[PDB]
Amino acid sequence: LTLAITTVTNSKFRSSILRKSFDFLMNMPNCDYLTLNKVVVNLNDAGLALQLFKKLKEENDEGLSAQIAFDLVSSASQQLLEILVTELTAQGYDPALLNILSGLPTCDYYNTFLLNNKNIDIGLLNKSKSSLDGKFSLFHTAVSVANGFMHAGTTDNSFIKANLPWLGKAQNWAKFTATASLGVIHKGNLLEGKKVMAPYLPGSRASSRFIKGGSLYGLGLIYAGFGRDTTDYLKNIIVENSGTSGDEDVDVLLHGASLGIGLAAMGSANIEVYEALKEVLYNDSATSGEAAALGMGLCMLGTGKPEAIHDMFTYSQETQHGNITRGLAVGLALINYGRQELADDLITKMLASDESLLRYGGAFTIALAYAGTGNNSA
Amino acid sequence: TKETVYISSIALLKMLKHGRAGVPMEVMGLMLGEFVDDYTVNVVDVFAMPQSGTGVSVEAVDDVFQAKMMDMLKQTGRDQMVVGWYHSHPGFGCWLSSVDVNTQKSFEQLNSRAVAVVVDPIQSVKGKVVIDAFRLIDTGALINNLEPRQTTSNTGLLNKANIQALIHGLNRHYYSLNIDYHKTAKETKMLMNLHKEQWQSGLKMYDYEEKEESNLAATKSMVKIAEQYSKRIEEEKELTEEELKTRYVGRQDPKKHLSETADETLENNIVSVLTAGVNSVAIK
Amino acid sequence: HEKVTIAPLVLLSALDHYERTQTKENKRCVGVILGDANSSTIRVTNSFALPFEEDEKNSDVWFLDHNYIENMNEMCKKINAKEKLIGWYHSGPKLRASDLKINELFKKYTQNNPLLLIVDVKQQGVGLPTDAYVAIEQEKTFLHLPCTIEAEEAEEIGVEHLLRIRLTNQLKSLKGLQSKLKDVVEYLDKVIHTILGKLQDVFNLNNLQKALTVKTNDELMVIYISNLVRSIIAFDDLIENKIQNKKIQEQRVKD
């Protein structure tokens, strides 16, 4: 497994090698269950993936079937997680192993392990954020985002709740970090994560519509990859505002929605979210127009859609907007992931152009596709 | 929030040329462009304006001469909406304009995005093209839109910011100067064919063909004497310090004539190839 | 003859007029320039545009307004008094009836000969997209004048901020010799005499070269004197690192 990745160039030849090792390990004579896990993740084959669970039904072990289930959900891509949940249900499953692949105990590992022993060292933390209330949002971001690191996963709102003054000193754009910090702190909550943003959710209004946009972004960090339940929730908000906008803060509400729907659907190809964010790009929005391209690029990860490669690239030359062109440049980098030489057609167009934003995203396009095994050409 | 102005390569050169002549002489000009608040900012065309007796002021703008240019600039696409004005002043430590002070407030009534650009160097440019603009603040900078989220803010580090006399406060209530320049495909190839290092163009095949061959009478004529000049440069150095120490006060003396005579041999090797490159059509 | 010196700002802004309106081949823009035409070297310090309308299918259809120039000149009088109209420029390589007639309208406000400039909007081939021509009669004859690019001190410095040997000439010299072969073939089809009579005299400039071969190697031998200097330079290249190489063994004892 290790040598063939850095040696065999053909993807189909190394694909057959992983299939031969599955037959010798199929009988499971107390053999390695981790080797079979790396086979189904690299191949992403629904036939070999569901076949491993069928063997766990014949030989019944609750400790052996668990270690396989918890290992697959962590190492799987977004497309394979749907096979282990949606496709597995149609062909039959294990009621004990279904909740594991859905991420319920997996997200508990992030919440429970970090909550037992957590030392934030509030002594040195207070001196950093008590220095000044000024410096615009540069100071309020540094104290809020760094604080969200220590409490990440433990669901502690003490920065927002227990400390009143640091929240009020923030401006309209500075309240985004204070709200998005809860998405980092409460990350891993598949049930009460919506109750954290409950006062800022749509229909409950807010103190302002600038801070309201940050609530839709906090749902993206917590539910990322599991956000299938929040897919239709975050999509309907964009469709209502997809027509036009009469205010600046309305785009801020859709700004966090585009980044929120992008993280929940991240890695999964969705034509509905792509077409919903495509109409926002037609309006040529200065604020929400950049997040619309970032939300589409996260859905195009992996193979992606070849038609969306030239479509998003054409809109970059037609629409000359600061945030828009830079947002499309990153979106064109995310649409090509692991393609290696298959992305050279888009890389050549960016290197030949003298635009600063096209060359900014052209480097990361090489970084995403040529990652893993090193390439002397890249 | 504060605007980020992107000035095209064509408009940046016109504003420097109009406010060029003289230190004391002040002029005025108008800026055109089409952009939207917060991002999308741009400057398309700029042109000079007629000056009144008060110099830079709000009443110095003549709408009669301005309306006639709108139909003239519309054919080539130069006609846009007025995005502000640019001016030239001798310059001081603070308030570069000795005339215009509060007139910018009258400019804000007509356009909220209009600014006044003043050229600091006045033919002092060292190549960085440092220009100064202004934006009205009045009551603000407390619980309002957050300007310093864009680029290069918190100016005034130590005693050196821009002019270095302004430091933090700048002109009025920290207007937070933001200026950027950009170029297009047509602007990139045109400048390289006009001014890059020195302009030899207009004949591409005759550049090194005319200069390194037909110009030998004014350049390499009496090449036997020219070879003696290469010896005098080496004799000026090699003859001094042969001990590789400090006696005659020299160090790089062997490398002083090394790089100077390297091009002389190189140029003689280039014309040597171009000598056979004349292509006299000899053969047999 | 005379000389023409055009600032890089005029040639840079003239090409921009084509892209902004997405002008097709049926329309050609015309504009004016300023400077001092009194001396023998024409200097262009300014340029403008004009609302010029023209029909492509009919060469007898053109529209030019001189009242817009009058209102524009009065604005320049309050700005720069030394700027007067030295001529005008038009877009496109083709010279039709509409382009040749309008040259007389600008002669009313221009004392000297108005400068003729043919602007290439496609910038296809070689350099100098806009050629400088002069109008003179013996039928109007347009002669080419030397084109030089020289600007002021502040203008040349500002351009460097925007952009911030032997093989180079040979690459453009190969395409120049091939283009001259096509100019003779294309001119032959147009006839079936004036240019051919001049080219034969220019081409006129081994019978007498039997004894002229010695002077070729004599110049190459003087070049070899510089190659002996190159050998001395190579001998000096051998002395440079020996200063460092001997200090390497000196550091072995210290360390």
Side-chain angles (χ1 to χ4, degrees), chain B residues 97-130:
Chain B
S97 178
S98 63
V99 176
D100 183 3
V101 175
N102 290 336
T103 302
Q104 184 63 58
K105 183 178 179 180
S106 296
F107 296 159
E108 296 301 321
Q109 294 177 336
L110 296 175
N111 189 340
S112 63
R113 293 173 296 180
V115 296
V117 176
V118 176
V119 176
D120 187 7
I122 307 301
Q123 295 176 336
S124 296
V125 177
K126 294 177 179 177
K128 294 177 179 178
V129 182
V130 176

Short mmCIF file of all heavy atoms in Angstrom, two decimals, chain B residues 97-130:
data_model
loop_
_atom_site.label_atom_id
_atom_site.label_comp_id
_atom_site.label_asym_id
_atom_site.label_seq_id
_atom_site.Cartn_x
_atom_site.Cartn_y
_atom_site.Cartn_z
N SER B 97 -2.37 71.73 0.53
CA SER B 97 -3.05 72.79 -0.20
C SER B 97 -3.20 74.01 0.71
O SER B 97 -3.91 73.95 1.72
CB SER B 97 -4.42 72.32 -0.69
OG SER B 97 -5.09 73.36 -1.37
N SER B 98 -2.54 75.10 0.34
CA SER B 98 -2.66 76.34 1.10
C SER B 98 -3.96 77.08 0.81
O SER B 98 -4.33 77.98 1.58
CB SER B 98 -1.47 77.26 0.80
OG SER B 98 -1.46 77.65 -0.57
N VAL B 99 -4.66 76.73 -0.27
CA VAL B 99 -5.92 77.36 -0.62
C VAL B 99 -7.07 76.47 -0.17
O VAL B 99 -7.87 76.86 0.69
CB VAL B 99 -6.00 77.64 -2.13
CG1 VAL B 99 -7.36 78.22 -2.49
CG2 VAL B 99 -4.89 78.59 -2.55
N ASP B 100 -7.16 75.28 -0.75
CA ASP B 100 -8.24 74.35 -0.42
C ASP B 100 -8.05 73.82 1.00
O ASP B 100 -7.02 73.22 1.31
CB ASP B 100 -8.28 73.21 -1.43
CG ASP B 100 -9.42 72.23 -1.18
OD1 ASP B 100 -10.23 72.46 -0.26
OD2 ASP B 100 -9.51 71.23 -1.92
N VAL B 101 -9.05 74.04 1.85
CA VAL B 101 -9.07 73.49 3.20
C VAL B 101 -10.43 72.83 3.44
O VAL B 101 -10.53 71.61 3.54
CB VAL B 101 -8.78 74.57 4.26
CG1 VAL B 101 -8.93 73.98 5.66
CG2 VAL B 101 -7.40 75.15 4.07
N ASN B 102 -11.47 73.65 3.53
CA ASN B 102 -12.83 73.18 3.74
C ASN B 102 -13.64 73.06 2.45
O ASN B 102 -14.82 72.71 2.51
CB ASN B 102 -13.57 74.11 4.72
CG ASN B 102 -13.04 73.99 6.13
OD1 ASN B 102 -12.45 72.98 6.51
ND2 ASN B 102 -13.24 75.04 6.93
N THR B 103 -13.03 73.35 1.30
CA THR B 103 -13.76 73.25 0.04
C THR B 103 -14.15 71.81 -0.26
O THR B 103 -15.14 71.57 -0.96
CB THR B 103 -12.91 73.83 -1.10
OG1 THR B 103 -12.59 75.20 -0.80
CG2 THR B 103 -13.66 73.79 -2.42
N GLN B 104 -13.40 70.84 0.27
CA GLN B 104 -13.76 69.44 0.10
C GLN B 104 -15.15 69.15 0.66
O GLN B 104 -15.84 68.25 0.17
CB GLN B 104 -12.71 68.54 0.77
CG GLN B 104 -12.94 67.05 0.57
CD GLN B 104 -12.85 66.63 -0.88
OE1 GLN B 104 -11.83 66.84 -1.54
NE2 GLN B 104 -13.92 66.03 -1.39
N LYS B 105 -15.56 69.88 1.70
CA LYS B 105 -16.92 69.72 2.22
C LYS B 105 -17.95 70.09 1.16
O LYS B 105 -19.02 69.47 1.09
CB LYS B 105 -17.10 70.58 3.47
CG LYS B 105 -18.46 70.43 4.14
CD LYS B 105 -18.55 71.28 5.40
CE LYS B 105 -19.91 71.16 6.05
NZ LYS B 105 -20.02 71.98 7.29
N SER B 106 -17.65 71.09 0.33
CA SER B 106 -18.54 71.42 -0.78
C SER B 106 -18.51 70.34 -1.86
O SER B 106 -19.50 70.16 -2.58
CB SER B 106 -18.17 72.77 -1.37
OG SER B 106 -18.37 73.81 -0.42
N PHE B 107 -17.39 69.63 -1.98
CA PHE B 107 -17.32 68.52 -2.93
C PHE B 107 -18.13 67.33 -2.46
O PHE B 107 -18.66 66.57 -3.29
CB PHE B 107 -15.86 68.11 -3.15
CG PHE B 107 -15.01 69.17 -3.80
CD1 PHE B 107 -13.63 69.13 -3.68
CD2 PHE B 107 -15.59 70.20 -4.51
CE1 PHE B 107 -12.84 70.10 -4.27
CE2 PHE B 107 -14.81 71.18 -5.10
CZ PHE B 107 -13.43 71.13 -4.98
N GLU B 108 -18.25 67.14 -1.14
CA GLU B 108 -19.01 66.01 -0.62
C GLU B 108 -20.51 66.18 -0.84
O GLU B 108 -21.24 65.19 -0.88
CB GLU B 108 -18.71 65.82 0.87
CG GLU B 108 -17.26 65.44 1.16
CD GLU B 108 -16.85 64.16 0.47
OE1 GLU B 108 -17.67 63.22 0.42
OE2 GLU B 108 -15.70 64.08 -0.01
N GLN B 109 -20.98 67.42 -0.97
CA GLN B 109 -22.39 67.65 -1.24
C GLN B 109 -22.77 67.18 -2.64
O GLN B 109 -23.87 66.65 -2.84
CB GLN B 109 -22.73 69.13 -1.05
CG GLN B 109 -22.59 69.61 0.39
CD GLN B 109 -22.87 71.10 0.53
OE1 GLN B 109 -22.75 71.86 -0.43
NE2 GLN B 109 -23.25 71.51 1.73
N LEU B 110 -21.88 67.37 -3.61
CA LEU B 110 -22.15 66.91 -4.97
C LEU B 110 -21.95 65.40 -5.08
O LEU B 110 -22.79 64.70 -5.65
CB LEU B 110 -21.25 67.65 -5.96
CG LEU B 110 -21.48 69.16 -6.08
CD1 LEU B 110 -20.44 69.79 -7.00
CD2 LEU B 110 -22.89 69.46 -6.57
N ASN B 111 -20.83 64.90 -4.56
CA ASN B 111 -20.53 63.47 -4.61
C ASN B 111 -19.90 63.07 -3.29
O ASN B 111 -18.94 63.70 -2.84
CB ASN B 111 -19.60 63.14 -5.78
CG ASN B 111 -19.43 61.64 -6.00
OD1 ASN B 111 -19.69 60.83 -5.11
ND2 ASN B 111 -18.98 61.27 -7.19
N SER B 112 -20.42 62.00 -2.68
CA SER B 112 -19.88 61.51 -1.42
C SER B 112 -18.59 60.72 -1.59
O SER B 112 -17.81 60.60 -0.64
CB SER B 112 -20.91 60.65 -0.70
OG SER B 112 -21.22 59.49 -1.45
N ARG B 113 -18.35 60.18 -2.78
CA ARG B 113 -17.14 59.42 -3.07
C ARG B 113 -16.04 60.25 -3.71
O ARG B 113 -14.99 59.71 -4.05
CB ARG B 113 -17.48 58.22 -3.97
CG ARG B 113 -18.35 57.17 -3.28
CD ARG B 113 -18.80 56.10 -4.25
NE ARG B 113 -19.67 56.64 -5.30
CZ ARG B 113 -20.20 55.90 -6.28
NH1 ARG B 113 -19.97 54.60 -6.34
NH2 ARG B 113 -20.97 56.48 -7.19
N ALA B 114 -16.26 61.55 -3.89
CA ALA B 114 -15.27 62.42 -4.51
C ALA B 114 -14.14 62.73 -3.54
O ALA B 114 -14.37 62.97 -2.35
CB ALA B 114 -15.92 63.71 -5.00
N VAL B 115 -12.91 62.72 -4.06
CA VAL B 115 -11.72 63.00 -3.27
C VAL B 115 -10.86 64.01 -4.02
O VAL B 115 -11.07 64.28 -5.20
CB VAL B 115 -10.91 61.72 -2.96
CG1 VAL B 115 -11.72 60.77 -2.09
CG2 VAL B 115 -10.48 61.04 -4.25
N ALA B 116 -9.88 64.56 -3.31
CA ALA B 116 -8.94 65.53 -3.87
C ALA B 116 -7.53 64.97 -3.76
O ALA B 116 -7.03 64.76 -2.65
CB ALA B 116 -9.04 66.88 -3.16
N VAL B 117 -6.90 64.73 -4.90
CA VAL B 117 -5.55 64.16 -4.95
C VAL B 117 -4.55 65.29 -5.14
O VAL B 117 -4.72 66.14 -6.02
CB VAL B 117 -5.43 63.13 -6.09
CG1 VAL B 117 -4.01 62.61 -6.19
CG2 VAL B 117 -6.40 61.98 -5.86
N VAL B 118 -3.51 65.30 -4.31
CA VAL B 118 -2.45 66.31 -4.37
C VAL B 118 -1.12 65.59 -4.54
O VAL B 118 -0.84 64.61 -3.83
CB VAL B 118 -2.44 67.19 -3.11
CG1 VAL B 118 -1.28 68.17 -3.14
CG2 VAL B 118 -3.77 67.92 -2.96
N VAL B 119 -0.30 66.07 -5.47
CA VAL B 119 0.99 65.46 -5.75
C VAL B 119 2.02 66.05 -4.80
O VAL B 119 2.30 67.26 -4.84
CB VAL B 119 1.40 65.68 -7.22
CG1 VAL B 119 2.80 65.14 -7.47
CG2 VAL B 119 0.39 65.03 -8.15
N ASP B 120 2.59 65.20 -3.94
CA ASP B 120 3.60 65.68 -2.99
C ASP B 120 4.92 66.04 -3.67
O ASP B 120 5.41 67.16 -3.46
CB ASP B 120 3.80 64.64 -1.88
CG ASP B 120 4.71 65.13 -0.77
OD1 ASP B 120 5.09 66.32 -0.78
OD2 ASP B 120 5.05 64.32 0.12
N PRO B 121 5.54 65.17 -4.48
CA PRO B 121 6.92 65.45 -4.92
C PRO B 121 7.08 66.72 -5.74
O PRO B 121 7.98 67.52 -5.46
CB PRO B 121 7.29 64.20 -5.74
CG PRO B 121 6.41 63.13 -5.20
CD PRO B 121 5.11 63.83 -4.94
N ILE B 122 6.21 66.94 -6.73
CA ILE B 122 6.36 68.04 -7.68
C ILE B 122 7.73 67.93 -8.33
O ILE B 122 8.64 68.71 -8.03
CB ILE B 122 6.14 69.41 -7.02
CG1 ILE B 122 4.81 69.43 -6.28
CG2 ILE B 122 6.15 70.52 -8.06
CD1 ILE B 122 3.61 69.16 -7.17
N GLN B 123 7.90 66.93 -9.20
CA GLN B 123 9.15 66.61 -9.88
C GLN B 123 10.25 66.19 -8.91
O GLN B 123 11.44 66.24 -9.25
CB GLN B 123 9.64 67.78 -10.74
CG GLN B 123 8.73 68.13 -11.91
CD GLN B 123 9.21 69.34 -12.67
OE1 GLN B 123 9.93 70.18 -12.14
NE2 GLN B 123 8.81 69.45 -13.93
N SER B 124 9.87 65.76 -7.71
CA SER B 124 10.79 65.12 -6.77
C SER B 124 10.67 63.60 -6.79
O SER B 124 11.32 62.93 -5.98
CB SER B 124 10.56 65.64 -5.35
OG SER B 124 10.86 67.02 -5.26
N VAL B 125 9.85 63.05 -7.69
CA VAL B 125 9.54 61.62 -7.67
C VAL B 125 10.81 60.80 -7.78
O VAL B 125 11.62 61.00 -8.70
CB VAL B 125 8.55 61.27 -8.80
CG1 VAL B 125 8.28 59.78 -8.83
CG2 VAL B 125 7.26 62.06 -8.63
N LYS B 126 11.00 59.87 -6.85
CA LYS B 126 12.13 58.96 -6.85
C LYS B 126 11.82 57.65 -7.56
O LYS B 126 12.67 56.75 -7.55
CB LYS B 126 12.58 58.68 -5.41
CG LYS B 126 13.16 59.89 -4.70
CD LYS B 126 13.51 59.57 -3.25
CE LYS B 126 14.10 60.77 -2.55
NZ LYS B 126 14.40 60.49 -1.11
N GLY B 127 10.65 57.52 -8.16
CA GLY B 127 10.23 56.31 -8.84
C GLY B 127 9.13 55.54 -8.15
O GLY B 127 8.58 54.61 -8.75
N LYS B 128 8.79 55.89 -6.91
CA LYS B 128 7.71 55.22 -6.20
C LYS B 128 6.34 55.83 -6.47
O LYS B 128 5.33 55.19 -6.16
CB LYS B 128 7.98 55.23 -4.69
CG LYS B 128 9.19 54.40 -4.27
CD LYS B 128 9.44 54.52 -2.78
CE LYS B 128 10.63 53.67 -2.35
NZ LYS B 128 10.92 53.81 -0.90
N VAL B 129 6.28 57.03 -7.04
CA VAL B 129 5.03 57.72 -7.36
C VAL B 129 4.17 57.80 -6.11
O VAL B 129 3.16 57.08 -5.98
CB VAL B 129 4.30 57.03 -8.53
CG1 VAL B 129 3.02 57.79 -8.90
CG2 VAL B 129 5.22 56.91 -9.73
N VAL B 130 4.57 58.63 -5.15
CA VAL B 130 3.85 58.81 -3.90
C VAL B 130 2.96 60.04 -4.05
O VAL B 130 3.46 61.17 -4.17
CB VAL B 130 4.80 58.95 -2.71
CG1 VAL B 130 4.02 59.24 -1.44
CG2 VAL B 130 5.64 57.69 -2.55
#
